[PDB]
Design an enzyme around this catalytic site. Structure first.
Site, short mmCIF file in Angstrom:
data_model
loop_
_atom_site.label_atom_id
_atom_site.label_comp_id
_atom_site.label_asym_id
_atom_site.label_seq_id
_atom_site.Cartn_x
_atom_site.Cartn_y
_atom_site.Cartn_z
N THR A 39 -31.20 -4.63 0.68
CA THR A 39 -29.70 -5.05 1.06
C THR A 39 -29.31 -6.43 1.18
OG1 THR A 39 -29.96 -4.54 3.07
CG2 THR A 39 -29.40 -2.70 1.82
N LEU A 66 -27.94 0.42 -2.07
CA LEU A 66 -27.66 1.87 -2.70
C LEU A 66 -26.55 2.41 -1.93
CD1 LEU A 66 -30.87 0.94 -3.48
CD2 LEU A 66 -31.11 3.27 -3.85
N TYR A 157 -31.75 14.20 6.11
CA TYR A 157 -32.90 13.59 5.55
C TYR A 157 -33.92 14.55 4.67
CZ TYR A 157 -36.96 10.40 4.72
OH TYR A 157 -38.15 9.70 4.23
#
Lengths: 248, 248, 236, 236
Positions: A39, A66, A157
């Site tokens: 990032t 992302l 997740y």
């Protein structure tokens, strides 16, 4: 005798630290040109420089968030100006936003899907060109044992890590005629620098779930990714390799 | 960089031909001492001599009929007189006795169980000594995609190939504290010299089940066994690796 | 709403435990039941108790899954008592728990011979009527440890995993005749054997052992009209 | 013998197809049913038809799984009509079939938003009564292609596989409150959509497509007393 990837270009997403970094270093150790993403572009370029100095490989760092389509497509413009194309993709990047289910905000849910699934989709689409052209490519999706077992506080997740299996098996079937092999690696409990934050009690409770009685190292995960990128895995596609010390 | 097994001793059952031979040659190519077994001691010794000449490794052939406990234990007496012990075991030996279920004799059933399951049990028990002592060992059980999918005319064979998965996961848990890793490889449709007997029509029908559009080679299976015997697989135990070109 | 009146169910090893619960469950739905045990006298006594409780036609036969001869004799008796079998529940099974390094060939071979080979022979003997009428249900009792593996149970886990290959393959062969073949894989179930033992329970999200009747209920589902499109499947 | 009188079942995307079959099946067992569709008028019409056919309390609500606002409004209406929900069937889903190399971000994102995120929000809104009373059933409709993968369906298969992780995780969280969470994974089922298409059938051992009612029957089993020890499971 040896696994050599000289002349290949590997992109590893989220590789400024932890498992992603270990994967990039492992591929570099085999002679692959590596592309590091994070990032922070500054951190990605710093990590690439360290890898290039350590292993002597061609390495490039790009900023890639992302969460952002614009960030991804922009990163690929920089990538395709630096390399002919991508031969190996490791979809490592992923996030958690752990909450018990009724306590999980829509943003907690959607961010995890956006990075882990949609990010993987976009990065993969962006990376296929050279693989399809030359009839050789390896895509390795990093899943998790919790995609298979489920896990309290990780419905978001676990949904994504399971979803990556459907992604893997479907894409494998579509790309098989072009000899582009698509597989998953599903790590168990891996010791990273972040493991240091856990209490000795709970860390012990985790280790007790593991027949080998130890956490795996990031390099042990990276080793399996390398295998999948190597000539030893030429008949494996649509497969998940569990790397969890006997947990599952 | 390289996978080296110099100084290791690998036993591969049923390795005078086909997949078993390819596995033994692959391990030999990595520098392993190899032990070749077949129902004919003469053929096993002939194959060992050819492998030793090709790769320059220490190789020994022993007669071992997995239908016979006496044959197995006797083979191990010869083995332990030739090597210090066994570091790597590949339980490759297996037979089929294909019959539609109601047409399957008790002998057709029991022979398949006797070789594929009980033979594996006995060979594994015989091979563990050095592995447990030194806290390092690899056991690789050759399963099959049909253990997972089922297959018409192979209720006996499929029962054993599925049973080997329970065998693998249970033994892995028991031996994990001693760092002896137990895994399975599940090949799909592999081209051997016996494939030549099939009609072009049905051989094509089989290939049509395979996304990669080709049968795998025995060496492609052997490559995955080698991976499991290598330092790249140090955190994998209790796992099955499917090698089937995308079929499953 | 699930009725099995007119059906004949064979449940192996049903003198006690999960096997008995399955037989009683099928009986409660109206099935004629055949009870088997290594003791023919015990099997007959259990059949009588079930027939008294539920009002169904019930028969007890001696069947020792180690012996082909025992199996043959049992089926000779069965086919003199019923037209044939519509439902088979392969429940009979044994454990001989030992750490692998302490496991004898007999510890191993007995478990395979009962749990796999016994199942094989019982199933071969049970298909005639099902194939002829194009309706039948075969339910194989596996175990969670066939999937996870378990320390001290390399032999038992091998058989319970093997039964999955058996189920899927046999389902494929019999599917054209509408004979459906499935497995039930119980977790940790509280039986007569449990009393001679909190820990295992910590592995169970529901925080409790299952009852034999809860396993029996799933077998009943598989024998019912509700499972008409399920074959080659394992229900955990 | 399976009765759901007094229970309230929400079945998403139940104006037609498998969803409608599930709602009718639950109704046939005595459940009050809530029908949802992107068209509130259609949902209400279907509810009226089901109520007339089975004699049950039925309600239709507009629910578009793309819209959090639509979902919220639907639940406001629901909770003014029933005390709460005892049974949830997450059936609503879409396909946007494209070869991966021809797939747009919208082809992808719409399928995830409906099939995963819609399911998430619907489920969050449906738990209150189940947790309070320590009884509830959540059934997620997956697909065989979530397990096998399928050409042209990388997006759909991702969602159907993802629903498995969702099911197992949620089952673990809710198990202490006896709220059971499972999935049904249909193969190839003959619906209204089938008519616009021998081949796919060659992949099916039974040699025939399943009917919507055959899928509905398995959902019914999961909502029944027969499935009291099943959670975190997929029934194929």
């Amino acid at each position: 005798m040896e696994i050599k990837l000289q002349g290949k270009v590997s992109l590893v997403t989220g590789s400024t630290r932890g498992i992603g970094r270990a994967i990039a270093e492992k591929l570099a150790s085999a002679g692959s040109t590596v592309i590091i993403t994070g990032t922070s572009g500054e951190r990605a370029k710093a990590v690439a420089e360290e890898i290039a100095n350590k292993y002597g490989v061609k390495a490039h760092g790009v900023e890639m968030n992302l969460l952002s389509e614009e960030s991804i497509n922009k990163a690929f413009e920089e990538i395709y100006n630096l390399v002919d194309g991508i031969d190996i993709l490791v979809n490592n990047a992923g996030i958690t936003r752990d909450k018990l289910f009724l306590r999980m905000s829509l943003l907690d849910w959607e961010e995890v899907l956006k990075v882990n699934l949609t990010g993987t989709f976009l990065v993969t689409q962006n990376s296929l060109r050279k693989m399809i052209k030359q009839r050789w490519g390896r895509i390795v999706n990093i899943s998790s044992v919790v995609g298979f077992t489920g896990n309290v506080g990780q419905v978001n997740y676990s949904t994504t890590k399971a979803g990556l299996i459907g992604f893997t098996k479907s894409l494998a079937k579509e790309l098989a005629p072009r000899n582009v092999l698509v597989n998953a690696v599903a790590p168990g409990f891996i010791e990273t620098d972040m493991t240091a934050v856990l209490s000795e009690e709970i860390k012990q409770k985790y280790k007790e779930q593991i027949p080998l009685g130890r956490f795996g190292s990031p390099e042990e995960v990276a080793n399996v990714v390398l295998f999948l990128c190597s000539e030893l895995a030429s008949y494996i596609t649509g497969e998940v390799i569990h790397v969890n010390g006997g947990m599952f």
